[PDB]
Structure formats: C-alpha cells, structure tokens
C-alpha cells in the first residue's frame, strides 16, 4: 500500500538523515559549462563530471553571503534533506563538498528548463496539462510530508522540466524537517498562505495552499493574488477572495476553493483524510496516480532538445568567476556540511 511504500521510504530517509554524506567530491572533478540560474548566495551551473562524462546541476553558495543573509541553518537543512531523499520528482544530491569560500551541491540536471519559462511563453496550460504537473506535485508533497518535511517555496520558477516532460521540484532552501509548528517568514509573496502572512505558527498545510496557487497560475496564466507591491498582494491573500476565469471548469474551481481555504479546519490536505481528499477530488478523476509515479503517462509537452548538455531551454546569465580564497571562511558555521 501507499502506507507501506511510505514507511519503507521513511526507513531509507532516516538512515541518511541521521548519518549524512559529506565531502563526496571536489571542485576540479567537474567542468563548469553554463549558469542555469542565479540567487542570493551564488548560482546553479551545468557542469560535466569528468570521470564519467555525466552532466549535473551544481549549486554554488558563497558561505559569507549565506551568513550575511542569516541562512546558515536553512542551508544546512537544504543539504541534509537533499542528500537523504529519493523520489522520482526530486533531484537528490549526487555529491556535495565545500572549500575555503563556497558550498557545493551536485544534482541531476533537468534539461527542459523552468516551468516558469514555458508557462509565461505559452500563456497558460490546458487543464489536462496543469493536472499532469499537479499530480506530480501532490505525490511529492505526500512523500515529503510523510518524512516530516515542509517544502515552503512551490512556484513555476522552482519546477524543472526533464527530458521526458516530467517535473523535478528543486530549490530546497526553505525545506525543513519539523514535527508540529514552525514560524519562519519565508516563501514567495504570491504563494504565501494567510497563516504565514499573519505571523502565526504554521505547518505543512502551507504547502497545500501553495499548490492551489500553482494550479490556479498554471491554468489561468496568472496567479490568484497579484499586484505591483508585496504588501498589496498580502492584503488580497488575507481577504482570500479569489476570482476564477470563466474558462475554469466547475471541478477546478471546487478543488481550488478547497486548497485556497483560509480556514485550516477545511483546507484540503489538512483534513482527517489528508492528501486523499485531493487525490480523490473529481478534477483528478482521470489521474492514474501509480502511472504518474511510474512515469508511464505520456507527457502533454516534451522539451525541444539538441544534445545531452544543450541549454537552449534556459535563459542566459552573466558568467561570474568561481573564486576560492586562500583563507577558510565560516568554517564553524558550515562544519557539518
């Protein structure tokens, strides 16, 4: 059963969680090819592992920048979790290491680019197209939540398309293993649950609210709560009044009403029957959950490819040195990494 699959996955996870892999490679084992994305502590690059010729995505964080941004514990969360998970729609760590200046995490490369890019270009996804992605997220969250993990940054920018048109949920920077409630103000304005905005203790139900935002955005082409400044976005979210495009099917609206529910006692994914209230909603009635998990379903969109390290599905970013100081920075802070 699902319960059986998940208990076994938890046994697997905890072994790695309690005894994390550390220092399993070094920088010069990799050829750096291109920056695929950037962020507050550095970037993610396409790299080639020389010994195998395999391509990977290497995330590089500047330790000093992590420290300035007060993201030390969050970064340690990211690495410790990613080395420990294993799931079809996640990119676990193949390798990690650090040097005087940086932290390095090496993961499976998803060559299809960000969902964000395709969603914006095309405008919006059909309900079947949105459902294919949504199913994969539902399953990932099922997996993650069973391990007492909250993800906390679902959005198109953070969903990578693979060669088969399936998803990888990347960007574990805010992911946290927590039983019960937590309090950090984090996430992305458009996707923040009202509990977060109202500075309450919250739980994994914030991820299910964020799923409502994503499905809405995929199907509409814009999010349910938007405005030029975050404060105005927060005011809309806490009203919770959502308006649906006329093209939204009856079932879709009903799903979204139950995901984008300000009342935690009624929010889908947070009820006594957990994720099954979502899995068994009418909008997903055509979804074969096992076949999605097995990647047997035919993806509604498959990315245009030229080669194994072709990068044409990514935007171009300015390439910046990877500099390594002769002095070790922030040794204590990142000792366990």
């Amino acid at each position: 059963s699902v319960k059986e699959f998940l208990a076994k996955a938890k046994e697997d996870f905890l072994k790695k969680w309690e005894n994390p892999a550390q220092n399993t490679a070094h920088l010069d084992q990799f050829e750096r090819i291109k920056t695929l994305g950037t962020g507050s502590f550095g970037r993610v690059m396409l790299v080639k592992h020389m010994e195998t010729g395999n391509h990977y995505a290497m995330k590089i964080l500047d330790k000093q920048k992590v420290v300035k941004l007060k993201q030390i514990e969050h970064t340690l969360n990211e690495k410790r979790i990613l080395q420990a998970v294993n799931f079809p729609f996640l990119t676990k760590l193949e390798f990690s290491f650090k040097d005087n200046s940086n932290l390095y995490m090496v993961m499976e490369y998803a060559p299809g680019g960000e969902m964000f890019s395709h969603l914006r270009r095309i405008g919006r996804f059909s309900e079947p197209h949105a459902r294919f992605y949504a199913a994969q997220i539902v399953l990932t969250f099922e997996y993650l939540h069973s391990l007492d993990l909250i993800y906390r940054d679902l959005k198109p920018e953070n969903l990578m398309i693979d060669q088969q048109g399936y998803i990888k949920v990347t960007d574990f920077g805010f992911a946290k293993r927590v039983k019960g409630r937590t309090w950090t103000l984090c996430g992305t304005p458009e996707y923040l649950a009202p509990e977060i905005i109202l500075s309450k203790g919250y739980n994994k139900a914030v991820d299910w609210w964020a799923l409502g935002v994503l499905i809405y955005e995929m199907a509409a082409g814009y999010p349910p709560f938007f405005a030029d400044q975050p404060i105005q976005i927060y005011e809309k979210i806490v009203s919770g009044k959502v308006r649906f495009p006329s093209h939204f099917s009856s079932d879709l609206k009903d799903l979204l009403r139950n995901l984008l529910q300000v009342d935690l006692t009624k929010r889908f994914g947070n009820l006594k029957n957990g994720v099954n209230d979502i899995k068994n909603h009418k909008w997903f009635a055509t979804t074969d959950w096992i076949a999605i998990y097995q990647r047997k379903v035919e993806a509604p969109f498959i990315p245009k490819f030229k080669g194994p390290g072709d990068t044409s599905n990514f935007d171009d970013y300015e390439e910046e040195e990877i500099r390594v100081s002769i002095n070790e920075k922030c040794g204590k802070e990142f000792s366990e990494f």
């Binding site: 964000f116 984090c186 992305t188 304005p189 814009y222 030029d228 495009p245």
Partner: peptide
C-alpha cells in the same frame, strides 16, 4: 482584462523569495 493587468504589472518576471 486580468491577463492584460498581469502582463502590465512588474511581477511577470522571476519572483524573488522573501524572508525575515
């Protein structure tokens, strides 16, 4: 239209995370 309001907004690009 809502689509037109979105595309004219400053939030159609990649959206940054917030923290504390």
């Amino acid at each position: 239209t809502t689509y037109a309001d979105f595309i004219a907004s400053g939030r159609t690009g990649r959206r940054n995370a917030i923290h504390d």
